[PDB]
Design a protein around this ligand. Sequence first.
Ligand SMILES: [Ca+2]
Ligand SMILES: [Zn+2]
Length: 392
Amino acid sequence: SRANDAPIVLLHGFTGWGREEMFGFKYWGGVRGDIEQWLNDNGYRTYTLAVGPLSSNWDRACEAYAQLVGGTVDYGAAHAAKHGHARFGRTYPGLLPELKRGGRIHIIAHSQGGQTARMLVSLLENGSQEEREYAKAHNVSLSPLFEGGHHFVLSVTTIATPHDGTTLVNMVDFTDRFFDFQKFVLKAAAVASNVPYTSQVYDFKLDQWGLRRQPGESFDQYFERLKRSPVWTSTDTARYDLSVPGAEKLNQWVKASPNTYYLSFATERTYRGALTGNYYPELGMNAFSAVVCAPFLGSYRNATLGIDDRWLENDGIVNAFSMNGPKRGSTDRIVPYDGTIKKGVWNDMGTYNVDHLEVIGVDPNPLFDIRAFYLRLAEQLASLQPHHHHHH
Ligand SMILES: [Ca+2]
Ligand SMILES: [Zn+2]
């Protein structure tokens, strides 16, 4: 039973949006309903974050912080000068003002949101030495997020997160397919990609970059312009952070806080071929994944990059091997769940048979009791004890 009162905060990956976006079709729930609503009705206070889907984890984090405490998004002076984008972003009212008063939160994250959640914890706790130094050498102002000392997160839960990246980015035509993936997600919500909708619909929130869908332009047309923009061609991008090498760099500095609980959930929707060693998409896998991504992920090898047989099992988007926690270029410890949730370590909760999109309800799966999954997760989060008295 209940040991803490901390609210839950939901966070997406390389696709995602606000609750008011996509005509109310939820990222968290999809065709199965509204996950946040489910948790609230069952008494687990829950909120929802919406950050730039194609943005670097660093940008998201700066966005998350601000969206949480309120204020104007500060990407940090050293960071903005480094990558040529605006230092300042969109302003937010603050979902949880209580955070500045001593309160904590639980983050549940999907896909790339996992990387972001980890980074956010790091920045909250340690800040950025680079930013502090810059501020002092150029006499510029500094955001609190970079000063360290913030203790907002009691726990982080990751679901189908590419902690060590996804080999997907290695597809010869990754660029066009990744955008076809966005198009599929749009379709999933009954939204067309070839129609110049006047209403916002899907805000990619690229304020830092000066990018936005223009009037008369469909999603298909906007994606052609995004493809050639800095959010797809620079290192400060989700595209980079997504790669195996990118994930490893991020792992070099984004470490697990000894004051925070970490939970990992893995996904797979594949079967192994006996003659080839490869992995193939199961029945029921989202269409797109099954035709476009799955075959590549379950067959792609690269020994010079350390991609071997353990990397084949995938969930249609991300290699399963990458989900339990960051390992490549990491000092984080990963411990198998033995019935007891330990602090400052990745508690590997196992592997669940559902794809990348089914786990959040964007893709239908009648055999997966989604509500029960999230509810059981909320119960475990609530039982988390802030203080663990060392015993027999
Ligand atoms: Ca399915
Ligand atoms: Zn940036």
